[model samples]
Target: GPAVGIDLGTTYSCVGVFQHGKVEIIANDQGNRTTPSYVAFTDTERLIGDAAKNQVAMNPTNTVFDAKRLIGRRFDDAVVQSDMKHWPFMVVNDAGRPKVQVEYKGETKSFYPEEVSSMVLTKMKEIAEAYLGKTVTNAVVTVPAYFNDSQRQATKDAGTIAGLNVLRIINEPTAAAIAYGLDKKVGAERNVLIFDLGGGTFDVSILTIAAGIFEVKSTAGDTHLGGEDFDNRMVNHFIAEFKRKHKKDISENKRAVRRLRTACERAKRTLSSSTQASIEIDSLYEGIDFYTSITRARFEELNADLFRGTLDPVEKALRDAKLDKSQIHDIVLVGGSTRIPKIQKLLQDFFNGKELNKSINPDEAVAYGAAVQAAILSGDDVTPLSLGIETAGGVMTVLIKRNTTIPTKQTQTFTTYSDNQPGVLIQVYEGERAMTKDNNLLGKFELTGIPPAPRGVPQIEVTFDIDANGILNVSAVDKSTGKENKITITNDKGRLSKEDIERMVQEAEKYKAEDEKQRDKVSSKNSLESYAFNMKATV
Candidate 1:
């Protein structure tokens, strides 16, 4: 009766457990409940969670985290690469996938974001095993609500690397709402919004909870904006001040800039609770006195632009849910950034004076919700629903639209295009696009039980069943013969059908030993320091 929940965050990650209808956060050996979501490597041993963060001071290049921003993102995503400049490790493009290179003990190593994340997940699994005194390997994970298909696949890939069975990739906002609803015992008929601004991603989701049914009506957000964005602004503020005082630009100095970035990030955290934070540097160009004090007001102003960017998506979510500020009962603020007085007040103004829910710590809400979902998925008490798709001839049809009840079933019928056509091909898609071409192509399969008589003579029924974690299972059956047909989904961005995912999983497993050996070799090698190349890694 033991089940686990994981919040795979951009800045931090945590694992939750369900016991006696309640959830508890698992603490690591450091006595910290939340892990730093980082991975650091030595010669043969890897450190995760807070250990990795602590090791960065001694070995920045060997410690990597915040790789979540690169997962499933294109090398062409300039906005992402621009932010990566501050990160200590090397960000590279590996066979069209975003990758990071690490150096330790005179060697360079490479890892996908998934591999980095897997190290963190492995830490969580280790904690669970110790806590339960049993070998636990399965879990339900929470991801950002706005995560695209590629991002989701990358998360699952992380699960693969960590050697854990990831049951679901629930949205962080949705999970926070579930925890909020349960803790507050919210009315079964109320509609609420979960605004999650984490250290690395921001998400706004509107949900309706009634009769034990939790539905996500509309989800939207900016993945690139979060508390880390605030830290970067602070870093730039110091850089500009240093440049003006020293009469020189050090932005091109990658090593110094990276060190300054790390210092500014730490100072920003201190400023969160202090009026003035001091940042110190050893020797800039010469024995230059490079130091700056960051006032709280200046800190807020530096991050104001990012705070404003959150409004568009909030407005869009309102439009999608068809609710004005007046209809929203309680707007829950979930994320570390919500702690800032300015952010809280800004959200208050956006809601027209509705008091923002301050009951749950923005940092803890998502993990709590994840635990609730894990409990639901591990049991048979509640039925989960799915979102379905159909290609509209001249228009696209959305079957089982967003927020529909789970475990619910529906059907859409289509006809053949021409007479004497051998078979009918069904291509499923997922999106709000009016045109079928605009939506994401989920997968495609063909119905082959058709006769040579006519195209209309072929009739096949397609069914999509989504379990608790939002993972889908689809099947097609010919009505004439009452026989089921095998469905195969093409690998679009590596999102394959069950069989394809399984086969790939097997292949990936078969190559695991060699992959790990190469990864370890790459991890231990030294490489040219960043700033040696002028190539742009951005989109």
Candidate 2:
């Protein structure tokens, strides 16, 4: 089991490993340090990474990029609905989830978002394996800090499908901090901030790094804002320019948009390092060669609000962490989008001329962090938010406070609402809000077999325990009768059952037969009241 780190990003993916007492980024056969996060299926074969991205202009519909956006989400989710318009692949409803369809072996096949992401992870595994000349199974993957339990579960499911035992699904920002701390004095204590603006999401975190331990104090971000959005701004501008000059509507042409987007990304990089960038594509649309140029000023003007909006989360994290800007000794940039000059300038100005730190490679820092975590394998950590169970009404009775050290447990006692009540439900939520509705629904389970007793006679003790691995295990006991019930939910919200994950790795011939029969058996959303009343725990 080769321990490694993976940065399964929205726009790109990278893999690394700790070797010779340092993290080493493993390049693909293409010799590139980072690969585009893309998967494509054609009449003959399936392709991933550079191979998949290289043919997007010719096969936009069958090429899947940005699968990260659809993972752990439903077809009807607002975020999915908004991002659907930008994707060229075919996305249809699979039960309540979004399934992407593509052609393989001259037949049309569909896959869940997790399945598509697995292909990217599989490629990363292969890259690492090639470098080490051995099979790699254990890995620590990084995700956006703001990702909820559902998203994190879906990401873990992807690793499972890729034949990886995901040791930990750590936050990208936290990993960034760990990578940064590896270069500092072992016992030094400093408050540092992580600013990450990658292809698909923007995240910021403030943490205290001391004695080789990195504890995050606060994190805040928008899941939708990213470098891809910035590139889209330039794409739309050029599309409008083409229409004005050629008198042709090309918005409906998928291939043309793909071609322009590629050029726009190239122009985006050029603009980052120069005053002006030009875009040229021969026969871009309707037998017309499109040519356009944008100044860095114009590019920033188009996305001024988006650029400035990143600071909002930084301010929020600082407030949540209860620290002043001046107290943030070092601010590390950790994503590809952070290279934008305008973004850097604004961050510097916001911190009152404090120079933003860039000690590590932003593109590979996340993977580096993951590799470091994988090397450590086990370490103490803290909770990012308060976790508690719902009470009589809509109130939250916190069991674990925010920023509390994990691998800890707490138990609280309560009485039944009615005389001779048969059971009770533990609705676990994670958030700081007093109203349970304002908090995130982590999971819920019904504790049955409670001996009938008077309302105040039954002593039901509920214990909330978070293991070192960060898996939450909740148990309830009827102290009088000594009966207990427990449940372990990775994330019921993500809706992937254990059987489904195992079935995904099995041969297609075996799964195709049951796929049709199990379509309706997949997990469905349960409302707050419904879930609270229906969850049955295994005794």
Candidate 3:
């Protein structure tokens, strides 16, 4: 009956559990605390984690990664459109949302972003189950603090698909704070800055921890910025150099591009620890060797903008928190990207030479905090921002303001616009924007069956209730006719419904045994293919 914590990351993922009043990181069957967030498809099976990542070079087109950036997003979104240029897999519009299309088993298929993310979550669940020696049906999943209501709901849907109860969808920074604050005394009041730079996203959050209370001051981040951007910079640099040296463009080939990307990722990691790293790939393009040496300075220079990108969010977060650098009692770095020396130095300089609190493992801290939260050992949580509805002239009418304690309800009254008005549509939104269109639309519902009353004669009371789990329930009542309607704002805005998720879960359950058999066959087939290719090349 253990509820686990899962860090469903973009580049990697980890699962942790709270045991004996302590957080313990769970290792996968491969005995790694973290697993690559990659999925590769074959005719027979789907590969997840390290197995998928290993096949990237051979099967770049079918290998999907970075699904986090596309989850709950439209194909028309600026970030998704921009990401299309970098990804090898095909991305297409499915009913206005982004979907990954790939060839699987000689048949082309399309997958929703939620389904792709669910596969990753399913692997994490398997890891936790294997480690605990029991089934874990409940989990607290961590997401980037900047994720919108739709994105958070999508994450919950993914958890549901993975056969988890999904007790809560916590913020990554907040989870890190919980992990860090657990050791402090109950009465301690500390303002901590969490700088999270992951593989595909960057977020900075400022929080005040007091007497077991975790209050978030503010958060700012660029969802499109992270370690992957740095890797891309390196990849572009190598591509340009190869073209310059050989007068040939290898970027057009997905396989060659993936090979270079792999090399670039390795070189970036190497440069993080060494002054220089060499990227060498034999016959990478048309029997031409791809070889290059890059210095750490050069790498930093090429990616200076990405490094500077993190600072703006940091400054914005501090500004929103209404605190100066001198007042920040603790600075905690979370995410694997923080290990870069240049990033560390820039943060140190920004803090005026102050030392950072590196007590928690950057990769595992969020998961650990999620574990603590799953056990219900943390304090009260609050909404990150105000929730409101759009009124006439596109004005955003606020009902519950940001930072309001959770499990709270507030009501607002409005009158009909015209005489004999039949009904009114309530468009619920989340943000502090002045215009409703500028904010994210959480949901919408029409309160019909209204009495034909003159304008201003109808009393419509709309109530907004946010529960402890951050689930929002909206209700509208027409006092004149005693008519009422309610709807729960989830990922219902052109996204999945409760029925859709339930069906997906049922299908997964139905195919569980067949899927496991296919996975084994695929694994064995991939090994054999790789062996045959190696033997042919060697002979």
Give me the candidate number with maximum TM-score.
2
Q: In model 3, which runs have C-alpha deviations exceeding 4 angstroms?
A: 20-22, 74-99, 182-188, 236-260, 278-294, 377-539
lDDT of 2: 0.81
Candidate 1, 1-539: lDDT as tens digits: 56688888877888888778778888888887788988887776678888788767777877888878887787668856786888887888877767788765557888888888888888888887777788776788887655667888889888878888877877676688777764255343467888887777788888665444445667778866787778888878878888878887788877778878888878877776787788878886456767667888888888877877788888898888778867777688888877877777788888788888878666777787787778777872122222344432322345665345455556655444456555655555654444344445666666675665554555566676655554455666766677665444332233434344333333333343454454344221211111111122556
Model 1 stretches astray by more than 4 angstroms: 57-61, 72-109, 182-189, 210-214, 235-295, 379-539
C-alpha RMSD by candidate, in order: 15.0, 12.2, 17.9
Better of 1 and 2 by TM-score: 2
Q: Tens digit of lDDT per residue, candidate 3, span 320-413?
A: 7889988888888899899898999999999999998667889899998899889873332665556887665445678997557778999988
Model 3 residue 291 CA deviation (Å) reads 6.8
Residue 301, model 3, lDDT = 98
Q: Can you give the TM-score per candidate against the true fold?
A: 0.61, 0.65, 0.64
Of 1 and 2, the candidate ahead on lDDT is 2
Clashes of each: 18, 0, 1
